[PDB]
């Protein structure tokens, strides 16, 4: 048949028929009869379309506007688009069924059909199926035709199409084909995939067919019981009832006095910070001008060119650090509007950037025997330090300066909005003036500046002031300069790529008072000042530190601590409001007629626990969140995640739920492996041990 189609039909018609069959998911090879039928229909449709054109007057003529537009043979989407456009242009109802031709002379859709039987029967069948919307014309190989309109075609066209049909029928009869003229998805597997399948079966199956049959037929009816009976008894959860005696202090090594005191490793001074204050009208100015004016106010500190070294950590060069600090001062105090360092070559070595290993191609390193992989740097095991407790005590106290300023919101028209506003007012009033809020504001501002310079500057050394905006009770606004930083180079795009930052921070705390807290800081005594008529020294803590893009990005997001500190209290307040109807915020914080103000066990002194107001608990929670941010690293995350289990076990013990632990030493070791050198983790372990002892005493009674 294929030869017949190739001989009797053009390549274009065959291609269109094959495409049409593909649209219907019918294989042309397996249904040659339908292929021939579609080819004949398409050829006759073109025959009617051809040899007809419209003149400028719109009258049919023989030749440019063809008198007919062919819709059969086009893709279903294109055919539907052209049919819809033709209907819309001429204001004709769009026929439901796809037409085969369109006549512009009458502006009517025409359907072309071919049948072996009487033309009238097929004409009536098609009219019933479609109706009178579309003009009907049906041709038959017996030289009989049925046309809805007799003026659509002239004698020549009908004669030509009938002659072509007669020739096709005669040729089919000659080849004895006219009488002869009367699956789904097959996802076959290849040779490679089948071979991989055969060798990916469990032990005991030679090929995938064996596994298929075994899973399809064999039914297990107690294989689990047989295996459990056959399995050794040495494997088991080995559970043990948990008791207060089972619980023991976590990380006893922190009480060893041979280990070094854990040092201060925060990016910026938190409780020892000193901020040079310059009162301002309130206008916002660039950090460089802020630093310049603040230093101008304190001329003695700015003009101090002679350093009095108090202590150099282990390797920090006093000359390098002091020269870098003087370069920062000169750059900030210069007339130029750029905070760029004016040396850019001394700073290459002062910051330690120039002491970087040189990369070489692999072959030399492979040949060079002396090149070896470096041993990992284990974190030192330290013991508890009192400075962490002192910082916790100090950061949760109220100060005279509030640095947290938030945008306004729309007016409140609903009671819910009013209660929310009241709770927000109480929360902010409690936490506005706490020192942790000022420290958090300083941290976020510094990190935002660091990131802005990181993306703005790549291969240069920038001076970044450590600045803050602080408003006191009277409403006066101050710009506070806490020091300066050298942000050097970067030259590295991505998430984890160190950017050297050399921080010089003002302070008023003598490093000799607590020597073990500052083994990383090179501090000079740069001057003195009279805060309230009393002389007080001013040291300059200098340190070299590293940071990444993610670190600065999350430093900008240290304000969410505020949210974390409110959610908690909200819930607490909410719970009280559940106990008794009326709003409990005022009663919880200050007390009312029928409720004493709420109090929480905050700490202890001389071995006796101490209670504090709800506001003190708020400040403590906020400080805890801020310290979680500041001392956040892998160690803190691991310690918190692993100690949550112990906290939940202790809670179950308190409620007399009879907790059971399948193994306790494993949990304890997992918790303790994260207590290496993070000050917050060690202090939290100490606090956990103290609270666990208190809970044991309370349980005894």
């Amino acid at each position: 048949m294929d030869t017949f189609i190739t001989r009797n039909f053009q390549t274009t018609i065959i291609q269109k028929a094959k495409n049409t069959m593909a649209e219907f998911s019918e294989d042309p090879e397996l249904q040659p009869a339908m292929l021939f039928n579609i080819c004949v229909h398409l050829e006759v449709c073109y025959v009617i379309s051809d040899m007809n054109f419209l003149d400028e007057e719109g009258k049919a003529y023989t030749a440019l506007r063809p008198q007919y537009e062919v819709i059969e043979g086009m893709p279903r989407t294109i055919a539907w688009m052209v049919q819809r456009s033709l209907a819309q242009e001429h204001g004709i109802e769009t026929p439901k069924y796809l037409a085969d031709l369109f006549d512009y002379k009458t502006k009517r859709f025409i359907e072309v059909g071919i049948t072996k039987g009487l033309a009238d029967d097929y004409f009536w069948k098609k009219k019933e199926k479609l109706g009178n919307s579309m003009e009907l014309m049906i041709f038959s190989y017996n030289q009989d035709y049925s046309l809805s309109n007799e003026s659509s075609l002239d004698e020549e066209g009908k004669g030509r199409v009938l002659s072509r049909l007669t020739e096709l029928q005669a040729e089919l009869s000659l080849k004895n084909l006219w009488q002869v003229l009367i699956k789904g998805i097959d996802f076959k597997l290849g040779q490679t995939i089948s071979r991989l399948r055969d060798i990916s079966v469990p032990a005991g199956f030679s090929n995938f067919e064996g596994m298929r049959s075994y899973i399809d037929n064999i039914d297990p009816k107690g294989a689990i019981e047989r295996n459990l009976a056959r399995m050794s008894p040495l494997v088991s959860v080995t559970p043990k009832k948990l008791t207060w005696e089972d619980l023991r202090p976590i990380g006893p090594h922190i009480y060893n006095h041979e280990l070094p005191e854990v040092p201060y490793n925060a990016f910026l001074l938190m409780s020892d910070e000193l901020g040079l204050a310059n009162m301002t009208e309130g206008k916002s100015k660039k950090p460089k001008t802020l630093a310049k004016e603040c230093l101008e106010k304190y001329s003695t500190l700015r003009d101090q060119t002679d350093p009095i070294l108090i202590m150099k950590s282990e390797k920090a060069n006093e000359n390098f650090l002091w020269k870098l600090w003087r370069d920062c001062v000169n750059t900030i105090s210069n007339e130029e509007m750029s905070n760029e360092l004016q040396k850019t070559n001394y700073a290459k070595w002062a910051t330690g950037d120039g002491l970087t290993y040189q990369k070489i191609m692999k072959e030399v390193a492979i040949d060079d025997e002396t090149m070896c992989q470096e041993e990992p740097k284990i974190p030192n095991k330290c013991r508890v330090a009192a400075w962490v407790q002192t910082e916790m005590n100090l950061l949760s106290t109220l100060t005279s300066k509030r640095a947290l300023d938030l945008p306004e919101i729309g007016p409140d028209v609903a009671p819910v909005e009013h209660v929310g506003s009241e709770r927000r007012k109480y929360f902010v009033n409690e936490i506005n003036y706490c020192k942790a809020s000022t420290v958090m504001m300083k941290y976020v501002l510094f990190h935002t500046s660091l990131l802005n310079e990181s993306n703005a500057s790549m291969g240069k050394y920038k001076v970044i002031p450590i600045t803050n905006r602080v408003v006191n009770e009277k409403g006066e606004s101050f710009d506070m300069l806490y020091g300066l930083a050298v942000k050097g180079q970067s030259h590295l795009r991505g998430d984890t790529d160190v950017v050297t930052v050399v921080t010089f921070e003002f302070s008023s705390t003598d490093p000799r008072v607590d020597s073990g807290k500052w083994p990383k800081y090179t501090v000079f005594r740069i001057g003195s000042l009279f805060v309230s008529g009393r002389e007080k020294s001013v040291y300059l803590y200098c340190r070299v530190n590293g940071t990444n893009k993610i670190q600065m990005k999350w430093g900008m997001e240290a304000r969410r601590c505020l949210l974390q500190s409110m959610q908690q209290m909200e819930a607490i307040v909410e719970q009280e409001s559940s106990i008794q109807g009326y709003d409990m915020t005022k009663a919880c914080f200050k007390g009312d007629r029928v409720n004493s103000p709420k109090t929480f066990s905050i700490g202890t002194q001389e071995g006796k626990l101490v209670k504090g107001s709800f506001g003190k608990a708020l400040r403590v929670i906020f400080t805890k969140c801020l310290m979680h941010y500041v001392f956040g690293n892998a160690q803190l995350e691991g310690f918190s995640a692993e100690s949550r289990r112990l906290l939940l076990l202790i809670q179950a013990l308190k409620d007399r739920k009879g907790p059971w632990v399948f193994d306790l030493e494993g949990m304890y070791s997992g918790i303790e492996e994260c207590i290496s050198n993070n000050p917050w983790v060690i202090q939290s372990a100490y606090w956990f041990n103290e609270w666990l002892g208190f809970e044991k005493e309370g349980s005894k009674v």
């Binding site: 079966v201 409110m566 959610q567 929480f600 403590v620 803190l636 995640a641 739920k657």
Partner: protein
């Protein structure tokens, strides 16, 4: 007086104050440097839990294959991958008996959705491993490159529409003796220019490429001291994994134990319903205990052979073609190959030199030049090391690949409910790697016997529960999916507040999106009124800082702030100004669901509303903001478009070529952007037909002159589709 934060737990339950215990305000621990050591450790651990199985050589790739399934039963309490096929089949049969006709329904539904699925669906996902460039590229980029290379190899079907022919040609490509593709060649011209080169690889090399998985380190993972490895597969496995995951999800959605497909505010409902049902089912005078469980090495002990068995069992009554289609992803996972990081750093201090040893050259240096841990790692890795820098990882799985199927296996383990007809009954919840159990018996001793029996049964199925991380107590208090249940009160507190910052689309879009996050947090996460108001305040602060749009009365100096202040003084009605235009923020709790353009329509002065909403303005993903999340906004001058932010010239040029082709197609067909075009024909022929019809319509409608019509038809004839 020393402040002890933990003392807050004296006056509060731990669950109530659990939120403060999460250090989610700090930097998530990222990975510094190479992730090769972590990948090697993962391979070593995976082969350590299956080293008592059978070891053979894969005749297809030549790798060393380890099969623990049907191996010796465990003799200690270490993690074990020796799952017994008969036990797994028994568990699956019990699960099917419990739920009549669930397997057949899931198979039928998955089959139908597969028949309807198209190739474009593979463009949805995350970074996929591209074999042409041996790198990681987006799903659409990798799919297009694979289609073009298959065209180069005469492999067609990707242009046939449905996903079945595309996957069939993917299977066929594994048989072609040589694979010809387009590769990125970086030539030095000084400059380095990447261009296209017609590269060719062998059948074995191509097979290894298809089975390879690219391994990075899991960065930003919160709550763990040490990092791990995260793997992504290529396009060859994506469609089959998609079908298998659809089947597994169909099964899971009908299981009450299943907790993976459920999402949102229903988690608390699932926890409460399970706890209440268990308490009701408790016998009178008996004891109900709850085990807060945890699976460690969960993905390193699950076997692709077991998953193949589960797929075979689930599709017991289905056409053989669908069974074969579903059995492919487990097959390509049992023979997977792990690409190991990017090498190791070796340095000399006396010479102040450093070098990267790439993975292919790991063993080309004497092991004495590696540190102790790396030396041991490489010594144990040598048997499974391939000369191309990859390792053979037959046993175990990779996290995030087969999650629904793993949940199905866990639920099958949970559904046994008893062993030996003893005097207890257990039932629980499972979701990927996190499970919780409840055992009801007559005394605590029997409950612990039941817990031990469950532990052993899980050991039989390849499931390992961490004894260190798992504990038990009386029913009424436990943890599941980082949500703490206690006496009927559920705290789903892992600090679900994602971020109260600008989404990063544009002014109006970001404002609408952020307000929507705050409102949805209220609705779903039990966020309070005051906390939500403070969240609004913080978001407004961040938005104003980012877009340089502060209040017109503010003293902030800037390029846009000058014009903002000028508008502030110009406009009579200040309250109607948009925030991006320095106007007041009028958002509160009640009106978080209304676009700010509409909210201020009545308060806007006529001039400003006309200017902002000028019908023909020069400055004008609207549905979903890139996960796909819908945001409601209003067209306006603030809806502007963003800029198109080792010099890449030819790749960028190809990008422009594709973009301009698509733009021309969209201009020809206006509905392409909204409704995805469908068709097996070339874009050029569709455009030619459309333009021919449009020219005819213009001529008949009088919109086109005769000369213009002649020129248009001449051009279209030159195009060659008339």
């Amino acid at each position: 007086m020393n402040i002890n934060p933990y003392f807050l737990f004296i006056d509060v339950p731990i669950q109530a104050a659990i939120s403060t215990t999460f250090p989610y305000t700090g930097v998530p621990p990222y990975s510094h440097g190479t992730g090769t050591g972590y990948t090697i450790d993962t391979v070593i651990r995976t082969h350590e839990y299956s080293n008592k199985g059978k070891q053979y050589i894969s005749d297809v790739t030549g790798c060393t294959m380890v099969d623990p399934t049907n191996g010796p039963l465990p003799e200690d309490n270490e993690p074990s991958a020796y799952a017994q096929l008969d036990c797994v089949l028994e568990a699956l049969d019990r699960m099917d008996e419990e739920h009549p006709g669930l397997f057949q329904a899931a198979s039928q539904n998955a089959m139908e959705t597969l028949m309807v699925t198209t190739v474009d669906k593979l463009t949805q996902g995350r970074q996929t491993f591209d074999w042409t460039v041996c790198r990681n590229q987006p799903a659409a980029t990798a799919l297009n490159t694979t289609i073009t290379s298959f065209r180069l190899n005469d492999l067609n079907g990707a242009d046939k529409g449905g996903l079945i022919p595309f996957c069939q040609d993917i299977i066929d490509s594994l048989d072609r003796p040589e694979m010809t593709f387009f590769s990125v060649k970086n030539i030095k011209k000084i400059k380095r220019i990447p261009m296209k080169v017609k590269d060719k690889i062998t059948k074995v090399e191509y097979i290894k490429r298809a089975l390879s998985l690219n391994t990075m380190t899991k960065d930003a993972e919160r709550g763990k001291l040490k990092r791990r490895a995260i793997a992504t597969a290529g396009i060859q496995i994506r469609g089959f994994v998609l079908v298998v995951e659809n089947l597994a999800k169909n099964i899971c959605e009908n299981l009450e134990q299943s907790g993976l497909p459920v999402g949102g505010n229903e988690k608390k409902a699932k926890l409460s319903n399970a706890v209440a049902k268990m308490l009701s089912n408790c016998p009178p005078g008996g004891i109900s205990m709850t085990v807060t469980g945890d699976n460690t090495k969960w993905n390193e002990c699950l076997n692709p052979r077991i998953f193949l068995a589960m797929t075979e069992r689930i599709t017991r009554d289905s056409p053989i073609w669908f069974r074969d289609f579903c059995s492919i992803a487990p097959v390509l996972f049992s023979n997977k190959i792990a690409r190991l990081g990017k090498g190791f750093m070796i340095t000399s201090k006396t010479k102040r030199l450093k070098a990267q040893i790439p993975c292919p050259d790991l063993f080309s240096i004497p092991l004495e030049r590696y540190n102790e841990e790396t030396r041991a790692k490489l010594k144990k890795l040598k048997p499974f090391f391939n000369e191309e820098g990859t390792a053979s990882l037959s046993p175990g799985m990779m996290m995030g690949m087969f999650n629904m199927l793993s949940t199905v296996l866990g639920v099958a383990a949970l559904g046994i409910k008893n062993i030996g007809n003893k005097e207890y009954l257990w039932d629980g919840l499972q979701s990927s790697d996190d499970f919780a159990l409840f055992v009801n018996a007559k005394d605590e001793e029997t409950c612990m016997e039941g817990i031990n029996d469950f532990y052993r049964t899980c050991k039989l199925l390849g499931i390992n529960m961490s004894k260190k991380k798992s504990y038990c107590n009386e029913t009424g208090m436990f943890e599941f999916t980082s949500m703490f249940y206690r006496d009927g009160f559920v705290s789903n507190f892992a600090m679900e507040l994602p971020s109260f910052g600008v989404a990063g689309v544009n002014e109006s879009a970001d404002m609408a999106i952020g307000m929507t996050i705050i409102k949805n947090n209220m609705i779903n996460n039990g966020m309070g009124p005051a906390t939500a108001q403070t969240a609004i305040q913080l978001f407004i602060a961040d938005y104003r800082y980012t877009y340089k749009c502060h209040r017109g009365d503010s003293k902030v100096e800037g390029k846009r702030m000058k014009i903002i202040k000028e508008l502030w003084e110009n406009t009579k009605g200040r309250d109607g100004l948009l925030v991006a235009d320095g106007g007041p923020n009028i958002y509160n709790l009640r009106n978080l669901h209304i676009p700010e353009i509409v909210l201020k329509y009545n308060l806007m002065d006529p001039e400003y509303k006309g200017r902002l909403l000028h019908p023909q303005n020069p400055f004008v993903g609207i549905k979903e903001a890139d996960k796909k999340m819908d945001y409601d906004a209003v067209s306006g001058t603030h809806s502007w478009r963003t800029k198109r932010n080792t010099d890449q010239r030819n790749m960028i040029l190809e990008e422009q070529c594709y973009a301009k082709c698509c733009n021309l197609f969209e201009a020809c067909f206006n509905s392409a952007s909204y409704r995805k075009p469908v068709g097996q024909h070339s874009m050029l022929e569709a455009m030619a037909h459309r333009l021919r019809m449009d020219a005819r319509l213009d001529y008949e409608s009088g919109r086109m002159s005769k000369d213009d019509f002649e020129k248009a038809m001449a051009h279209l004839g030159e195009i060659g589709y008339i």
